[PDB]
Design a protein around this ligand. Structure first.
Ligand SMILES: Cc1ccc(-c2cc3c(N[C@@H](Cc4ccccc4)P(=O)(O)O)ncnc3s2)cc1
Ligand SMILES: Cc1ccc(-c2cc3c(N[C@@H](Cc4ccccc4)P(=O)(O)O)ncnc3s2)cc1
Lengths: 336, 336
């Protein structure tokens, strides 16, 4: 569970070494690339990247897991983490965030600022450098390049959808349908489909139908993951989650807002209008109080139960011929 | 020369159509992608993209130029233009520019701002969507994906080098060697190598040595192009160039600065220290006056002559077995 993790984090050092070599006077730029890698790619939980390694091992017969194969698996897992780091660095600029991962946002560091835009682009580029360096001779090379490019496009499109929805923001826009759509494109594809799909290609499983089948399970898991995330942001024990929720004083298309708007009287819509996004804590208290009044903790608990049933059904119908454990190991990481 | 251009600009409409389709509720995002394409990809001179088409025609026997081949050529030319548009939109944010192409910078438009970061990423992604849609069945597909990814990486690295060199900027940093290095990575590879290299792959010419040979000529042309650009920014007739120069009141690693620092007394270094980058026109007058005093117009004219000789020598030594006209047509566009 957790020793596989230390191995994953220990490979990081090698990733940075290979990325940060023969050309003299680009030295200074390569030094900066190293600082960008170390600040931004380190310090998460590594679940997405690790999924690549775990799934790879569950998919591949042990007798085709030589040292070089495992190394490619580690490297591709790190590519998922670099993709994520590209997105976060850029998203923190666009949202004007202060911190991430308990640490000052890269762009907020003295002397970085909007130069972080190029830093982020570099993180994106390192994906394709690594795929080339480690995977270019493999039959799935082109498949992995395309999967990463496509994952980027889907995430960017979801970002666009998110930015159109939350500019002067309006709750009319925040429907269930638009919420699911943002989650699918902006979170679920890269977080859940990408890592398993990558493992699948590395293992030789390249059929469109199998990929489509895995995708159906994995995008559904992604939807639940984000909804639970939204729920917890407010109702989570901050000393368990290690996270203090800020969605409310920020005008976010949270799942809670979507359910609240579905369930609200005209009178209640106004109380939400007046309190959602003020940074005063009396106002933040208000919104929460209204969520309780409509028993969104109960709507959620119900949703979670239904979602668990649905996912197990999807695994039953669509897993084969992959081992159900590939999907069940993920489901266990996100249902409690 | 100029009718090939109208055809190139006319294909644009098709590019936008294919990029901006089956999925309902991502409609809003796709509408935004269209506005991003139309604002940012249109309104240049299209020289880089057009080079793809011209070189392709000079390379390919006429009897393998069916309607579909030409269409791929147009599309890949547009991919060069999309790459450029990605870079510009992002660079204008990082530099805090006001205008580009005589038009307000995309990020400066009301309601865009730092959302332009995601817009730029989308422009980048559209490259790979187009390559897939038009070129996926072709034997050079992977070669073009890799060439575009590599061109992006080289340009980003050059950008990093540029940003480290011009933060509180210092003229100590602005050496000839660092100047050439920024130009090579940030401008020459994507502007000059990329379009010809793309044509070459489309024409079936994929050897490393031929690519290396073309690269040698093309990176040298790129160096001259940028140096002439720097020269003209200040000494160009603004009603011929259609451009009013701003390098001086902006602290840029211009070629003029590099030559000036090489040729300056201690006393002259100070006059440059005091005037480079003030927006007052008395101060901008000063710098110019000092450039004339050191006869940089004569250094340039000499440089240009030597550079022409050198390029013709490179074409002689390294063109074959490509038709010299591929390179000479470019040389004619940039020497006067
Ligand atoms: C593909 C993929 C897989 C797993 C995850 C994450 C899991 C997880 C987590 N998991 C705990 C359970 C949990 C608590 C709170 C929210 C979600 C999950 P654990 O598995 O360590 O017991 N705790 C905190 N953050 C995360 S992010 C994300 C993407
Ligand atoms: C690959 C490639 C090829 C060509 C170019 C450019 C050419 C060019 C230009 N050319 C004129 C000449 C010229 C004037 C001023 C500076 C450079 C070139 P023309 O060829 O239209 O007579 N005028 C203004 N801008 C440009 S950008 C850039 C990249």
């Amino acid at each position: 569970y957790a020793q596989e993790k230390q191995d994953f984090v220990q490979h990081f050092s090698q990733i940075v070494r290979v990325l940060t070599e023969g050309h003299p006077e680009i030295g200074d730029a390569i030094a900066r690339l190293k600082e960008v890698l170390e600040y931004n790619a380190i310090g998460g939980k590594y679940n997405r990247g690790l999924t690549v390694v775990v799934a790879f091992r569950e998919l591949v017969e042990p007798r085709k897991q030589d040292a070089d194969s495992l190394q490619r698996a580690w490297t591709v897992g790190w590519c998922v983490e670099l993709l994520q780091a590209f997105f976060l660095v850029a998203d923190d600029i666009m949202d004007s965030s202060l911190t991430r991962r308990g640490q000052i946002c890269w762009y907020q560091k003295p002397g970085v600022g909007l130069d972080a835009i190029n830093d982020a682009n570099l993180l994106e580029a390192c994906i394709y450098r690594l795929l080339k360096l480690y995977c270019r001779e493999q039959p799935y090379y082109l498949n992995l390049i395309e999967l990463f490019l496509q994952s980027s496009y889907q995430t960017e499109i979801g970002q666009t959808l998110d930015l159109l929805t939350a500019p002067n923001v309006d709750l009319v826009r925040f429907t269930e349908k638009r919420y699911k759509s943002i989650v699918k494109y902006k979170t679920a594809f890269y977080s859940f489909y990408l890592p398993i799909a990558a493992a699948m290609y590395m293992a030789g499983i390249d059929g469109e139908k199998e990929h489509a089948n895995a995708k159906k399970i994995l995008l559904e898991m992604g939807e639940f993951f984000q909804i639970q995330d939204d729920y917890l942001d407010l109702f989570g024990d901050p000393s368990v989650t290690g996270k203090i929720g800020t969605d409310i004083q920020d005008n976010k298309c949270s799942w809670l807002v979507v359910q609240c708007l579905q369930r609200a009287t005209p009178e209640q819509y106004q109380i939400l209008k007046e309190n959602y996004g003020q940074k005063e804590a009396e106002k933040v208290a208000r919104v929460k109080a209204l969520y309780e009044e409509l028993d969104l903790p109960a709507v959620f608990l119900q949703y979670e139960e239904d979602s668990y049933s649905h996912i197990m059904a999807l695994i039953e119908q669509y897993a084969a011929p992959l081992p159900p454990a590939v999907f069940l190991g993920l489901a266990r990481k996100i249902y409690k």
